[model samples]
Structures are given as structure tokens and as C-alpha cells.
Target chain A: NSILKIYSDEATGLRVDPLVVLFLAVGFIFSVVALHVISKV
Target chain B: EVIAPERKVPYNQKLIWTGVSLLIFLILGQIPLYGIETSDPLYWLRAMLASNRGTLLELGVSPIITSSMIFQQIAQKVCAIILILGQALVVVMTGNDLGLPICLLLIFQLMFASLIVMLLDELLSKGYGLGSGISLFTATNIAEQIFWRAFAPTTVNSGRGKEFEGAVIAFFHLLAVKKRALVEAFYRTNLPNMFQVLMTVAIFLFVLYLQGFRYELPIRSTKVRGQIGIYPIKLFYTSNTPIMLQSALTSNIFLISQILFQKYPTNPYYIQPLMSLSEALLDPIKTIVYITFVLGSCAVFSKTWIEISGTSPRDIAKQFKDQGMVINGKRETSIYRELKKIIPTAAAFGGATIGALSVGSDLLGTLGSGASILMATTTIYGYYEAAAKE
Candidate 1:
């Protein structure tokens, strides 16, 4: 609703983006693990 | 000249040795050192380079990482000079003085800390630990970063609104505030974006696939009666070497230029296109230059690294000769020539693909630079393979 004075446009969303980072981490792990399974098979 | 440990390390202590090294590294990384303040601008760059700001781990694994550049004799000497110089530069650049004696003392502590890390690495690799200490340490650090980035409840100002920094928490907060367009939060400023997350996933899958691309050359034992199999030459011959070099080079320039800019913000010459997203991604000419430098250097390094790594065709051929194994029905001479033909093209393609990926990730604005993620995944995966082989 309102912009914080401390915040800057340049480094925006850097902190609050945890959910996406989680989404990213999950996907990242999935790729690595998924491949390991295939490689072993 | 040296006294070895009196007795054996017992049946199973490798995991403990590695765990001890990781724990030591993490603790040291958190202990603050001088020049902590006024170094904020270089913070992210330093971490990406594997340094933790104002800590005993201030230099981090950078000294060791740089040593991969040359022969051991040269690297040992050059690494010392770079460490000393890099410290001096950071101190001078920040225009900080924590008293001359204290500053010198802190730097000495950091230097010694890096030495301790190297010693621990040696101890662990000599049948005490799982995989290479460097890789273990890096994997641990990267995992920590990912955890903090994804789960830490730190507050972040999104420029549009205040919210929890974690994407999950932030998303719900947006809804709580009745913010418009929820999907926009995915790519909204300060939060991890959908596009970047997708890109990260794709890169992981791509590298996993790429690393599995093996060129098998059949070989049989002269000594072991019928030990027949193929030796694989992996696609990623350089294995993070090119990307690591490119990242170090890029970050060095960015640091020097940006630091200069701080002192003379008004100076036209001090500013660079890469100073910010707008200038970096939007400036056509600058973007072209950055992309070319990253891609070109990576390609060149990729082809060259295979030779210097002692794992090249010549080296591999030597290794095979030492192992008393050679291609069936072929003289030793043909193997080297065959390797020479196979490696260069693979190196180039591998380099090109990574270079493109690194730049593309930067352009797409991934959470950290693509190279960082690329380095982590490969190193961790490499550690897994190496440990399993044990």
C-alpha cells in the first residue's frame, strides 16, 4: 500500500521473495535428485 | 622430517572429519573481523565470490579457488600476493582504519584462518573425510545461503510495500493487504520471481543431463586378465573452471569500478553500464560487450583447461599407460591422437552452453547469479559421485 523510505527500487523484493526462492529450491532439488535416480537406473 | 599420527583413524571416521571441517568453517564464517562496515556495497559480490563479510572467513575460499589458475609452484606464490593485495585493496577502497595495529592483526588472523582451512582440507582428504574439503565447504555454504534466502523471516522492503522477505510469507502478506494482481508478486521487485525460479530449475536439469554426456572409449587390462570396459570423457571437461574464471573477472571489474564511483559519484568516467540493472541490461552496447567477454573467455578457457588440468588426453593417455591398459589391438600412440581429436570440440560446446546460460541467468535476474547456482549444483553433485566411489 505504501513504499518504505528505506526501500530502493534497485534492490526491491530482495527480502520478501522467500516463497519464490522456495519454489526455486524445490525445483532445484527435484532436478538434481531426479537425475541421480535416472543415472543410477 | 614430519611425524605422522601414531595410529590409524579406525574403521569409519570420514564423515566426522568432514563434519568437523564444515562446522569449523561455518563458525569461523560467522566471527566478525575489522573493516566490517563501509564494505556493504561489495557484500553480495563478496559472498558470491565465497567471502563472508568481516569475518575470520573474510577471504573465504577465494585464495584456494584462484590457485587453480596455474602451476602449483606459481600458484602458491601468486595466491599469497593476491590475498595480501586483495585485503589491502578492500581496506583502502573502503577508506577504513580500525587502528593500524588492529587492522594488521585482523588481516593476519584471516590469513592464518585460510591456512587452517587448507590444513583441515588436507587432513580430511587423507582418508579422514568424505570428499574434497573445498567442495564440501562450498556446498555447505551454498546450502546455507539457499536456506536463508528461502526460509529466513527477515524483513524486506519491496519498494511497493513492506513484507516478510521470504516469498511464501510475502505472497500471503500481499493478499492480506488486498494488493492487486497476486501473480505480479511472483516477479515483483525484491521477491524471487517466477521467471527466475523456472530458469534455475531448467539450468539444473540441463547441467545434470550435460554432465551425464560421456564419451566412452573401450579399454581392456593387460594385467587383470579380462577387465574390459570403457573410459568416459565427460562433456564438462573444465567442470566449473571457465564459469568460475569468468565470474571472478566480471566481479573484479564491477568492484573496482563501483568503488571508484563511490568516491567520485559525479565523475562521468567512473560510472559503468553494469552499475545497475537499467544501465546493464538496457544498454545495448554494454550488454553486448559483457555477453561477449563472458562467452568468449569461457570458450577459450574451456579448450585450454583440459590441457592444464593433467586430465587431458596426454595425461589420460599417460594414466592409461601407467595402469597397463590401452585400446585393444592399438599401439599406445593412437590413443593420445584420438583424445586430442575428441576433447576440443566438446570443450568448446560445453563452454558456449555455460556462457550462454550464465549471461541468460543474469539477464533473467535469477536470485543469485546463475554461475553461483551452477557452481553449487555441479560441485555438490560431484561430491556425491566422488563419495559414492569411495
Candidate 2:
């Protein structure tokens, strides 16, 4: 009846892609490292 | 069932696309003209080296001067067109499709450019004790360009070469470490794992703390027809636009003239006394003249724009009276009179401060690239605060 149901159903069924998860982790790590270096400088 | 609800686009995507497009265009345009194998370097070097022999005016006699001037003028006109189009696009796209941040950033950049020019004008007029109009215009124009060009990647690379590249890489490397250490250290330094939670809270609070601050002056009107109302004015009204307009006009003239000189370096007919003055002002002894001219012109323009916009008390009063509104304490006619007296003084202070801060920041290295950073920071802060209040 509503778009919310479609989104909720999809969200419940969705699985995180490993590659996407890995890339996100790498990005997070890199950003953290970069910020740390910057602060010291 | 419907698939998804509409959501606003992210600011980063918009900025990235805009930046990429701008960068691509700049590279495409500049590569043909100023590439290593191109005639541009030779022409630029010739013009620069020729400054040693004769005045910039005398150098304008070269055939290259006319062509270069034509090209540069075209580029500037193109820039103006792009700026207008981009601004209009931003205004249209705001809220629904685009984030407010993108629009805010775009406006901030413009405001920053204006602020820098205003500051430069102030320095020339009040500092170094220079008084001439032409001198002020010339000085501020050159200074602003120099400041803007200073941060340009090409200019930095050209000047600093490998050292600059290394410095940039090193900066990124350091930044990475700082980011990780701050997060980890907050957890370890304060308490066992508690620091991470506290740090998260602190960071959120800090972001919230980044709101804007504004000082509003209230206008009490007696002629409010049947109801009482107040007129509120921002402390820093007439913000940065006038300065930017003045800068655009000044820089456009210089850029065009410089291009013209590059095009015709050997033709006596093309050479003029103004070029000679331009050359002299660039020289060490007369550099103050250049600064003075830019700052003074900016100040004058700021005052003129204030009047033209009907921001002055007299004009505001007339409009208000027509709309059936009057000053709360004074007569409707006196409102204009009060404004007439108050506006000029306010303009003088604002104009002077804008000029001074721009120049002062440049000298201190706190504001660079026509004070773009200052402009961006101020505008963003101002807007964020306004939003917070609402």
C-alpha cells in the first residue's frame, strides 16, 4: 500500500556486500591515519 | 507499492561534480594555450623579461600584445558568464535536489573574494599613508590578483616545484595519523573504553557548537500605521558584494591590459601612459601606489553601492512610508534624515574594516587567495548560526 513497506521489506532482506564492507573499512582506516598525521603536523 | 521516497542529494556529490567540471574545463582551456610545447610560455616569458628593458606600456607595442589582451578579456568575460550561470543554477537547485551547503559554499566563495578586496582597499587608504585614488585602485587590484594567484596550484608548483609536491604528500600522511590517534587516544587517555563514547559525544557537541553568531540592531518605528513593528539590521550589512564587484572591475581591466601588452609588445601606437604607471606601480618603490588604488576604489564603491541599493536611511524611509510604516520614536520624514546621517558613518566603518582586515590578513598570511578562506569561513559561520536560531 505504501513505499515504506517496500523499503522495509528490502532492508530486512538486504545483505551487505563483503567488497563494499572492505572498501568502507579501508576508507575509514585511511581517514583515521590521515587525520592523526595532520594533527601532529 | 512505491519503491522509494524522494530524498535530498548530498552536498559532497554536488561539490565534487562542480569541482571536476571546473577542473576539466580549466585544464582543457589552459593546456592548449599554456602547455609546455605551446607558444604561451614563450609569449609569457617574453612579456615578463621585456619588463626589464622598457615599461609595460612600451612592451605593449608587440603584436602579441593585442592577441593576448583579446584572449584574456575573452577569458574574463567567460568567467563572468560562468559565475552568473552557476549562481543561478545553485539558486534554482537549492533545498529539493541540492543541499543548502553547496549553495552556501558557492555564495561564501564570492563573499570571500569581495571581503579580500575590501580589506586590500582599506590597507592602501589607511596604511602606508597613501592618498591618491588611482594609486589605491592599482595597488589593491595587483595585490588581490597576487594573493589569488599565490594559492593557485600551477603557481605553487611553478614556484616551489618538487618541494611543494613533497609537502602536500607529507601533509596528507600526517593528517591520517592525527585522525586515528585522536579517536584512539580519547578512549585510552580518559578511561578504559569510556573515552571513545565520550569522544563521540564531544564530537557531536562540537559540531553543534559550530553554529553562527549575529548581532542585530533594532529599528524602532513610530509610523507603523496601526501596529508596532521593528526593523532589524545585521551588524555587517552590505556584506562583501560591493568589494567583489569593485575587484572584478579592477582585475578585469588589469588582466585585459596585461594581455594586450603581451599581444603587441613592440607597437608604439598601443602603448599608453597608464601602462607606464602600471609598470611603475608594480616596481618596489611605487608598490604602495598600487595597494592604495585598489583599497580606495573598493571603499568608494562600497559607499556608492550602499546608496544605490537604497540601504541608506533616506531611501529606506521613503520606501517604508509608502508602505505605510514609520519610525517608532521619530517622525516618518526624520527617519530618512536619521538614516542619511547614520548610513554614511556605518559605511565608512564597515568599508574601512573590510579594507583593513583583508590587507592585514594577507600580510599576516591568515587570509590568502583574495581572502577566499576568510570569506568562506565567515559566510558559512553566519549562515549556520542563522539556521541554528531558526
Candidate 3:
């Protein structure tokens, strides 16, 4: 039972929210754009 | 076993009312009366000096002003370069194995450049024209002096009367006694120095926070022809430039009137109510009406400027018509018609914020008047940020 509970917790921890992942991806893209633009000017 | 429960409670109480209160009491009660008053007794003096002697043209005669302006222009250019380079450094450091010191140095360079830009913009904008730049600068300077006067050394007792008389006689030989006194009174109160530097920095930060705290409105273009587009409008536009323009005009008018009234006190025009209004604006009734007028003038001027500068719907409509663009099922007229509604609301938001900030700063303390510093800092930082984004 203890081993089963540990496996269940690990599986849930690995499962990420799609919305949070999407936002992070967008933010990363924006930061990259901002960095590129700022350097040149 | 235990159970959890949600509960709500209400209570009623009797209320008491006091008889009619004094107008002064109602207004002054919540105000930090003594603290505000004690901040700067010499505020008028500073304002007068700023209005007359703090113009760029006036300062152009002085070697100090000339040297400072030249140095400032050069420094601003250099700072712009540093900001650009610093952004580059950040990228390079992240991508490659660049030394940490180089990155640190670049950051410092950017910050220092910003500081120089702030100082120069203040000197040029305020010190040269009787512009909003000067008003904000004067406000900051006066506030600092007041703070220092209360807490700092009082040893700089260079006899104001003699120094002011000499300065006036040298600057304005034609001016009579009363005219000279008016000029002298303003200068004797506010002298820019180290304290101004500190006040400028504080105000710069406050202004940045305010400017940054903006409302963004999404704009959608209706499908016409084969394409659709979207844009965003800043709720706060033209920033504080309108206020600056209005203040400059008002100050110039007041100074010119002072000279004229002193020369022709017995004249019929001098006896008119308008003259009294001007006098009240520059004198005893100044604290109340002047603040309101400056704020109102800023809002009006800003809105007018936005409209005239082709930042409104009319401008966008003209552009669209030229490009053969249409909105919804209608032709270009619809797009322009929509803009007329949008621009005024945006202008109002910008104007109201500028006015409120200006008045609030005044009431808070003299240091609070650091609008020039705020503007200069914002411009520099904005430019830097823009460059970095590029």
C-alpha cells in the first residue's frame, strides 16, 4: 500500500497543467523577442 | 464526531451628527496641516525664481548653464550608447562564457548613463524654458530646501536681501524696486544643489511606478476586404507634456504681468478683475486656485495636443482612406467614426492621471514636485528598454 501511494504521488507530480505550460512557453518567446530587440537599439 | 458550520452575524448602531462645521475645519482636518505648512515657507520665493530666471535662454548667458548643457547633451548620447551596449552584453553573457565582471560593468554603465540622462533632461527642459520641466524641477528643489531647512544645516545665511538686490540690478537694470523684490523673493528661496539630486531620484522612482501602472485597451479591426488586424492603445498618453506647456505659459504670463503692474499700478487695466485674478494666481490665493488651474490646464492641453498631433481617430481614418481600407461592411468612414469615440476617452484617462499626480505631489511635500525627474527618468528608461527589446 505504501509503495502504491508513493507511485500515485509521483504520477500526479509529473502531470502538468496545460495552461501553465502554454503561458510559460509564450512568456519565454516574448522574453526572447524583447532581448533581441533591446540589444540592437 | 465533529461538524464544521458556516455562520453570519449582523449588528446595528446609532449614529451621531455634529452641527455645521467650519469650511476651514472640514478641509484642513484630514490634511497634515502643520507638516504641510512647515515643509516650505519659501515655496513662493522658489516658484517666482523658477518662473523668471530658470529659463534655458536666461541660463544661456551664464557660463555654468552653457557648460552644463553642452556636457549634458554629450552625456545623453553616451548614455544611449551604454544602454544599447548593456542589452547586448546581457545576451552575450547568457549565450557565451563571458566574465561576470563584464556583465556587472555593463549593468552599472547602463544605470550611470540613465542618471546622467535624467540630470541633463531636467537641466535642459526645466532650466531653459519656463516649461513643465522647470515647474517640476522647482517643485522638487523647493521641497528639498524645505526638508533640509527643517532638518539640515541653516548656515548658508548669505544675506538674501543684499545678494538678491545685486543679482536683480545686474540682471534687470530697468526694473524698479517692487519688480526687483518680486524677482529676488523667488530666487532667494530655492537654490538647486545636492538635496535636489536626492529628491530627483526619489521622484523619478515614484513617477516610473505611476507611468508604468497604465491601462491597456485592446483594439480590434472588423474584417473588411481580406484582412483583419488588432492593436492596443495606452490609456496614459502624452504623459506630462501638456501640464508642462500650460505651466510654462501661465508662469510667463504671471512674470510679465508682475513687471507691467509694478510699472502701471494706477492704470485702469491693472484695476480690472482679470488683474486681480492674475494677482491671486501669483499671490495669496495661489495655493488653492493655482493647483487646480495647473491640473485643469494640463488635462485640457494634453487632450488638445493628442488631437492636434494626429494621434486620434481622425488621423487613423485619413491613413486608412489613403490605403483603401474599410471596416465591417462599410467603407473607411466607419473606422474613423469609431476612433472619434475612442480617442477622447483615452485622452481623458491620461489627462486626469497627470493632473491628479501633479496635485497629489504638491500636497505630499516639496520633494513630491519632482515631475521633471520622473519625466526625464521615464524617457531615459523607456528608451533603454526599447533599445533592449530591439
Q: Assess each model's interface with DockQ, reporting 2 decimals per model.
A: 0.01, 0.02, 0.02
Number of the candidate with higher lDDT, 1 or 2: 1
TM-score of each: 0.71, 0.41, 0.40
- Candidate 1 wrong stretches, greater than 4 Å: A1-41, B1-12, B34-37, B40-45, B62-115, B157-161, B174-181, B255-290, B329-333
Better of 1 and 2 by TM-score: 1
Give the per-residue lDDT digits (tens) of candidate 2, residues B197-301. Answer: 333344334323432223333445444435554565543457665675565554445556666787987866111112223244355544455556656766788
User: lDDT, candidate 2, residue B204?
Assistant: 32
Full-model lDDT, candidate 3: 0.44
Error of 2 at B388 (Å): 3.9
Better of 1 and 3 by DockQ: 3
> Taking the tens digit of each residue's C-alpha lDDT, what string does model 3 give over B127-225?
221222333334443444445543442333565433322222334334545565544443333543333334445655666776655443333344344
**Worst ten-residue run, lDDT, model 2 chain B?**
B28-37
Residue B205, model 3: lDDT of 67
Cand. 1: chain B TM-score: 0.77
